[PDB]
Amino acid sequence: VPRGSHMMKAILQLILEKRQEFEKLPCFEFVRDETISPEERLILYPCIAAFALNFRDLNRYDYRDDNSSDYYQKIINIHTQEDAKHWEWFLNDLELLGFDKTMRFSEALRFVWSDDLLHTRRLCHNIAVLSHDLEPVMKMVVIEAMETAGLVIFHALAKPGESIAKATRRKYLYVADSHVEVENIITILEQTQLSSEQEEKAKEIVNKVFQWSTNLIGEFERYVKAHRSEKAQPTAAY
Ligand SMILES: N[C@@H](Cc1c[nH]c2c(Br)cc(Br)cc12)C(=O)O
């Protein structure tokens, strides 16, 4: 009924429209293609190395503010305690997939900072820069947009992930349903109102978040096309 609640609902509906467009990217059709072996489809998994530990830091140090009495910021802090745990899931599955290979320190560094992973590596950086001077209600819009994009990615990746978990009888934690199925942010947002200026800013936020996620998926697609002869090697980690 109140005008402030209609504006919030418009932003939450905008997130759904971006999600619908985001799900149609060709990278997700490849990852979901059951006719290609799941090891081949997960060749892009090491690309996430340029993201996952930065996402841990985004939650520990950029989103979180332990010295805050604000009601919304304390909800955000609770959310960050969950998401800051997931980098260990990424490293768990990196080893299970046979991608935790021995190499020179400089090869690991040149991989993470590769120009082919520029958008992947800078996603959390751009989010932190965008979020720094945001009031907590706008930070929540950032987090909700980010969580929606992320669920699209891991619903897709959980398909070849759970196929390998079943075919090898090993417990996957990151490309796995348990990660997908993890007072939520969306529940608080639906009860909260936005001012007129906040609705304009929230549109800019949602547009930027899904643009940077789309750039990241674009890099994943180019990476697959450059590594068609390679695949995960789960047997190397037995
Ligand atoms: N659930 C993921 C977080 C996440 C959220 N958004 C993401 C995007 Br957009 C791309 C990638 Br790769 C990962 C994410 C995690 O916990 O590490």
Residue numbers in the entry: -6 to 175, 184 to 239
Give the authors' words.
Here we report a third nitrile biosynthesis strategy featuring the cyanobacterial nitrile synthase AetD. During the biosynthesis of the eagle-killing neurotoxin, aetokthonotoxin, AetD transforms the 2-aminopropionate portion of 5,7-dibromo-l-tryptophan to a nitrile. Employing a combination of structural, biochemical and biophysical techniques, we characterized AetD as a non-haem diiron enzyme that belongs to the emerging haem-oxygenase-like dimetal oxidase superfamily. AetD seems to be dimeric; each AetD protomer has a 7-helical-bundle architecture, which comprises three core helices that house residues responsible for coordinating the diiron cofactor, and four auxiliary helices.
However, we were able to obtain a substrate-bound co-crystal structure of AetD at 2.08 Å resolution, which displays an excellent omit map density for 5,7-dibromo-l-tryptophan in the absence of iron. In this structure, the carboxylate and amino nitrogen of the substrate, which coordinate Fe1 when iron is present, now hydrogen bond to the Fe1 ligands H79 and H172, pre-organizing these residues for Fe1 coordination. Thus, the three ligands that exclusively coordinate Fe1 (the amino acid moiety of substrate, H79 and H172) are all positioned for Fe1 binding when the substrate is present. Diiron bridging residue E176, and Fe2 ligand H179, on the other hand, are part of a highly flexible region of core helix α3 (E176 to T183) and are disordered. Of the residues that bind Fe2 (D76, E140, E176 and H179), only D76 of core helix α1 has good omit electron density. Substrate binding therefore seems to pre-organize AetD to bind Fe1 but not Fe2. In AetD, the substrate binding pocket is more accessible in the apo state when side chains are not positioned for metal binding and core α3 is unwound.
